[PDB]
Amino acid sequence: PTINQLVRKPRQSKIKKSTSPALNKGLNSFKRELTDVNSPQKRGVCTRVGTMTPKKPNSALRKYARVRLSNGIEVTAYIPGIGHNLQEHSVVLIRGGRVKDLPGVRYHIVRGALDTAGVENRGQSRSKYGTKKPK
Amino acid sequence: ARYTGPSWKVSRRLGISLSGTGKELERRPYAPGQHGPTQRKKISEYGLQQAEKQKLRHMYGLTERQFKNTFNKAGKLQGKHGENFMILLEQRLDNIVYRLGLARTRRAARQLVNHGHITVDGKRVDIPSYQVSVGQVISVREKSAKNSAIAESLEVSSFVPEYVTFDAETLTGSLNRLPERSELAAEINEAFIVEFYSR
Amino acid sequence: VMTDPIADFLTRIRNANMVKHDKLELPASKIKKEIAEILKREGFIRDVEYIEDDNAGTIRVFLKYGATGERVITGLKRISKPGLRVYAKSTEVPKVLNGLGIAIVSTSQGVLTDKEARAKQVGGEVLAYVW
């Protein structure tokens, strides 16, 4: 566009969007409003657990969960590691990171921070899955 | 020192004669590990300019975090960016101890200084990172002058570099003039280092 | 010459350069005069002649080629366009092709190439690049 056609209306860039929208909200219990902050993790409580089937072409069975966050939003998260000890209505710590296979789930539970215990028998790559040093 | 591991793997994996010549690559020059004695794979250019970055800091055995800081400090110095960083990194008093022969190796010189065995201009200095400038004096503090190791390490005395002056009668030394790259080891290129950090 | 008779003038040189022509003529003006004389001072033009006419006269320009069929004027670019005028301060007059090229400046003391405008410490509108 010519310069004059560029001074009547300027160039406005795009607006890139967040990929983890439930980790950048906040609830003010006094006024009942959704604050706009940022936060690496949020605490939540479980509503229902279980398993889901992966999308094509993968054909395993994956352990998922549905959690109600501190800001009152209910979403679905993924349980990593080999097995879990997650009963219904337990406090968990959630974090970002999607999984390609399962369609709906976007968040990703931390292992070892809360009710979720450390994965059993991890000899390497142990900083994740939260298991102490086998002294 | 700072890396307290076996002294030969790093020298031969690196494809050079680290810390002198031929002591560690004399026999079984295959690269370390279960493999390495099998075959060599053509190194991608990223490997070319990374391993040769390793051929510098591994030569002096200093942790990386200050390899930047010396490199960054060397950038402000006028001249050629790659060459000066080699020059400045040669001014550490470990070399100035190792070059004079007061220590058999480099890592011994670091262990020598850290226990405060030397004094620059007659004052004790405790750290290997001090850089010495032209016209300074390096003595041995006249405390452990009769220790067997130091006199023994002066017996080899392969070839004292031109750009330093020394005598064992009074155990003194100095830096006559700024070295000139060629006077260094300079067996490695310097351009493949500057490229790596200008990524 | 609808809007810019200097932008047109540069183009008329470049078009006839591409096809390896030798002579070209075009209507004359006071500003077109010395801009055609400057190019003679650096050999970019073999020579220039003026013609008197009834309306305003024309100017005939003899374009120059080096032997072995190599062109001499390899391009032209305009900077002060009528839609967007540009002015350059004394210290910020650029050098074209690290001094191999030439730029034209209409300083306060007549049209001048920046070889001496920087030497005379003046600035003004920047007319064109030649390289």
Binding site: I3, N4, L6, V7, P10 | - | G83, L84, R85, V86
Partner: protein
């Protein structure tokens, strides 16, 4: 002594009593593309005798505040 700022401009209206509004149209390099854009803001002056007429060119000077907005006084009617 120190002098107040003195401007020029063109008369725009006189429907207000004993005061006139004059525009001062000047150029200004744009923010980013560097294109001169006609920028014009209009002040309010003072006329003791209402001599100045619409469409005239004058020179006005800053002064003490005199009304809610009136803070310039006329110096001379440059032309009609």
């Amino acid at each position: 002594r120190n002098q107040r700022k003195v401007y020029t401009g063109r008369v725009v209206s006189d429907k207000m009593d004993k005061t006139i509004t004059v525009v001062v149209e000047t150029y200004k390099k744009h923010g980013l593309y560097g294109k001169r854009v006609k920028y014009s803001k209009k002040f309010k002056a003072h006329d003791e005798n209402n001599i100045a007429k619409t469409g005239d060119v004058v020179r006005i000077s800053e002064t003490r505040p005199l009304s809610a907005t009136k803070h310039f006084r006329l110096l001379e009617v440059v032309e009609e």
